[PDB]
Amino acid sequence: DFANLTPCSENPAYLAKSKNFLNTTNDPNSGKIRAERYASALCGPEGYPHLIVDGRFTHAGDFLIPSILFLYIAGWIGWVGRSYLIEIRESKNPEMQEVVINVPLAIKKMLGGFLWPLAAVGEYTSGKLVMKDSEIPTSPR
Amino acid sequence: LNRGDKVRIKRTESYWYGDVGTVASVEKSGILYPVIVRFDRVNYNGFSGSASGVNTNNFAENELELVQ
Amino acid sequence: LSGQPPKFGGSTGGLLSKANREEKYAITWTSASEQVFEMPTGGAAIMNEGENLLYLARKEQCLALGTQLRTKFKPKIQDYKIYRVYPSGEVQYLHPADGVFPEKVNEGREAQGTKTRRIGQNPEPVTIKFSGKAPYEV
Amino acid sequence: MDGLKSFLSTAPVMIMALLTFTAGILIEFNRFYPDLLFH
Amino acid sequence: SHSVKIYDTCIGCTQCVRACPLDVLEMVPWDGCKAAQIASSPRTEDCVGCKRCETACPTDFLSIRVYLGAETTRSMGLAY
Amino acid sequence: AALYTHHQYIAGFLMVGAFAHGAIFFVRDYDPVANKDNVLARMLEHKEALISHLSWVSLFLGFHTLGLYVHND
């Protein structure tokens, strides 16, 4: 319920501080736009937006929409980095392709990473994502 | 095992235990470790600050599992 | 031990009280010409022509100079003999122990420290917990 | 010119090319759309 | 005095003896490798323990080992 | 203040020394033959999965906890 978190539209600490919001960019109304945007959040006793991350879809834009947007991009960086590393491993000189990146091969993989979650599920089902424990270098216990 | 045969190192003390290697030569002279195995990953070997290790080690028949 | 000392002006890196109380080390080599060698104590000394007798504090100092006699000189002095000198007058011939340099295999040498197994086939420390002996020992 | 293409495709240059382009995205997105604490 | 042990994975390329600065190691005849020689350690009383032999060993894991044991004047590398 | 800080600093010593003697256990007193396939051997068996996931959790926590503090600074 967050009884100790008043909304920022009815928070007197935020209302006395939103009129003195500074401009972060060259726009002279940057502090006014931030005052209207942060009014919909939940504020504490010091009039700053406290974010709720527990899983409520009312506060889905606090963490879940950052979570969905991050994991897509971070999955994209990991998947095209993994797929480039697999492709250059089959070449004559796999070592030199890491310090001297085959840039046309890199752009080909990086634009193909928009369908990484469908490619990750399919490669997990095919067994080419996860290696078996018998086929991996192992410490001597 | 012939030259070019792919083996997996079952010798636990080695750097390549669980890694795949390629048989380079087998010595027919009664050697305790007659099978020379070449690897694509060098080991830790060398002084501190060295950019590479050694990719070759001699093994016996009991320490190799057939892969290819 | 016979040999003239190399012409050296003296140094503070040389022998200490251990040389005349516990042990000191002597290196004896025959020089072809009057050359300049780096002392392991710091500084440059000049070889006397013929036999040379140099007293050093450690066996490592005699062998660092002996390594310098092998590879840093064009005539390639390869007959240096290294002795351990005791204060009781005992002179013990150390290197080479059989007259042949140890990187060359020699007949009559006996295997010391050789183990007829791998390092990974050493016994566990739990099986010899109260015996004194190490896993590499027994 | 071919080795100039190889030098421009080296690991220091391409990570400085990408991070400049990544900072080029993020600064410009926070210039036209600043102050985004949440969605 | 330290313990210098040589195991049967020796290939006999004599690199431990050439890296030895204290004349601890030497090559004895042997029948277990192609070079027909194994390193031995008859002079571990002069062993300082600096492990230059283990750096020079090319086999995997190590065909020569130095185990640091009791410290004497010789093994502590003291000129005094 | 003195009572809380004393008991936490003592408990920090006791926790690290617990894993320290946990490591003296594997060095000295551990038998892989008698502990074959039990819960102690299997901790050694997937020790690479244990260390890398603890390395993941520490990096997952530390990149963000410092990252949110440096953001807030």
Add this chain to the structure above:
Amino acid sequence: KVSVDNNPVPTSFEKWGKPGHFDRTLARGPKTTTWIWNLHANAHDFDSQTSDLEDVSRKIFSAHFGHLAVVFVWLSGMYFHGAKFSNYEGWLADPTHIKPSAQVVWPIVGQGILNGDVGGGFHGIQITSGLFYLWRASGFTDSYQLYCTAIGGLVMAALMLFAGWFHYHVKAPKLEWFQNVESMMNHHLAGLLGLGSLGWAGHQIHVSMPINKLLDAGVAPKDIPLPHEFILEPSKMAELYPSFAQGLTPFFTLNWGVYSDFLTFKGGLNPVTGGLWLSDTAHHHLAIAVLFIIAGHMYRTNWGIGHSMKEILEAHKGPFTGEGHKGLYEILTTSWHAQLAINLALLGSLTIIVAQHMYAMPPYPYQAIDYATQLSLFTHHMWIGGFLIVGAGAHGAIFMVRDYDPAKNVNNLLDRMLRHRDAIISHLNWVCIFLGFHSFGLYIHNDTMRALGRPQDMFSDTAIQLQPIFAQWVQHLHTLAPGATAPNALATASYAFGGETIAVAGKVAMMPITLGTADFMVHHIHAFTIHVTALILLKGVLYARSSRLVPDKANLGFRFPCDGPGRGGTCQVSGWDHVFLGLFWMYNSLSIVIFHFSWKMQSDVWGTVSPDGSVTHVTLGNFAQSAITINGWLRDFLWAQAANVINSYGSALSAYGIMFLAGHFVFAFSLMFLFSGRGYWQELIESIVWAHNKLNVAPAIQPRALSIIQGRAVGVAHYLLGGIVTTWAFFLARSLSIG
């Protein structure tokens, strides 16, 4: 004497795309991640790349040209930011009210708050480099003149880039051209320094002196005549200086006292600006110019007259020193590292001399009342000069490992230094223990006695006094120097020795600096910490080849980790590791020097001036009673004066608040590399390699932990990056706040 080789190295990009080609062990390609780090460590090690000294010296000459192109671009950037993004025209109208600023930040993510009000409506980063004070002393009036220097800096940088390519790929000089050191010293004393000082004395007389005399008279910067107008029309020039109309005839007929109106030995400071008189500096530079052009005729090159530097070194032998300086000429004409060790030692000493001279004789107008500029310029040139002194101990030890030949080094000074290594070091070891107990233990006695409520038992001015009587006598001799031992000097060399208090804008330019018990103790602290930094680096040079521990360290190299755990442990025995330990002690030495500087200026020099002549200081004279104790250094210096860096958030100085915490982090990040070691980290990576092998994302370039030297190199880099950035943000936020 000129001997070049026609096109030795072809110009192509084939080696640009093949990294590691310069080293034989890196040309085979990477196998581990150590190859990437070895690519950067060995990139400029030209002696390790090439055994030919001629090809080594050719790489060195062209790398100098490329380095000068970097400095000229950096110089051009400072003049371009002064021309385009600065209030220099605004500052030139009101130097006492407008703060200097030459960096404007873009408005993004709230960082536009750093564009503080520096006066006149301008908003930007308040600069502390002193460039505005330098340009006013150069006569810079309009921003177009700063812009033309910025274009000319890029032209000079392009010519530095062209001459680097020309002298490596087209016409590279031979080894005999490089080894003609008598020609090089004749062309650098009489050339670079002598004509450069003569050119600047010509600039100062014709440009700097008339413009600054009019700017101090009250003439607006719009109404100043241009520098070429003084050259073209000498009627304005003779109006400012009446004996200028006699022309060059009093110069050639030795009637030099005609020029005494603009070539003065005034001394002291200009009361209008607080800087040195440009009549003094032009007469300084001309007297400097005559001496180096005279001194650049000392050495014999082609025409018979002159000195052979070999024959000077051959003659200087004594009874204590054997053969003397014999063979040092062959050392310094064959070893580049031996010359670099001398040049880093003296340039590092020179930059410390520059810092120690520029605060007490401030050479620029309105510099001495900018307490931020005075604190920054002292601190920057202390840190630069201390880093170079550590590099002297580096390339001293690199020469001993690599280029020391004992065949041509028998019984000379370098042979005999090696022969009594235990005599030098153990006495240097003793004098560090004596100074450490008798400077720091004085503080510990003071810290204990003040804690026990015994102020009479302390070492202070109200207790057991330790007066620096020899420095007070030298200070007294300098105050009595005008009229007695410098009779033609109207004022003292500096008011730091004693005498007048100079006020410019209601702020002290310079006061007498009275040295008491606190100044005695902190100078012996400085004498202690310099001696340890000398102890670590001299032992690194002397014991680079051998010791009683490891007698074959010359074969091991200059930069090696150790010789194993044997002999108890030979950890950090290399000459590199003494540079590694010397960098910490240089940080420890210089941080106390700039802390002694920052406290003694604010407590006993800097402050505001009452109209009747009274001076109140920034920290109200707390150096005499609190700089005798570690707690006073903790409380009244560190805790009190960092209130400005921690309350700076939400203001223009909040970037200093960010960077003060930023350096605290990199300090703590260093101790991961310093305290730990790579066999933990290699054992940690190989579990992360397993999780990459689990998902088939293990790289072909095998991930390795850093080498032992690189683990020390990263840790000493972050410790000194973290520590200096902390002090930089502490000094800059405090000294912009005060005044």
Add this chain to the structure above:
Amino acid sequence: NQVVQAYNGDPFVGHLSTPISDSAFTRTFIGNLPAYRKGLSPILRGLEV
């Protein structure tokens, strides 16, 4: 001439015969100090120390 030589003839003992360590004045002062004076019993040379 040359006032620094080998200490007592041997150049491989780690010491040097210097004007501080092995001068004529040094040997007649150090050797005539109580701890080194010839013929003194330890009770008198302890007493004078």
Add this chain to the structure above:
Amino acid sequence: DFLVHHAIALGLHTTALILIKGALDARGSKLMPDKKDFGYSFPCDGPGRGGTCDISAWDAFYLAMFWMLNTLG
């Protein structure tokens, strides 16, 4: 209060990570498969094999003491 528990969680997990890796690699590792032969507390195995600074299981007690104090700090 939220951020500092995650610093505490970072402090506990990283201190556990050094300690568990010290315990699980106490018998050996790929850099040193004979750490049980060398005991719990040994300096190193020389600068060979790339360098083996602080490779012992005692040296992970050493490193986690800093992290335990940092967590307790």
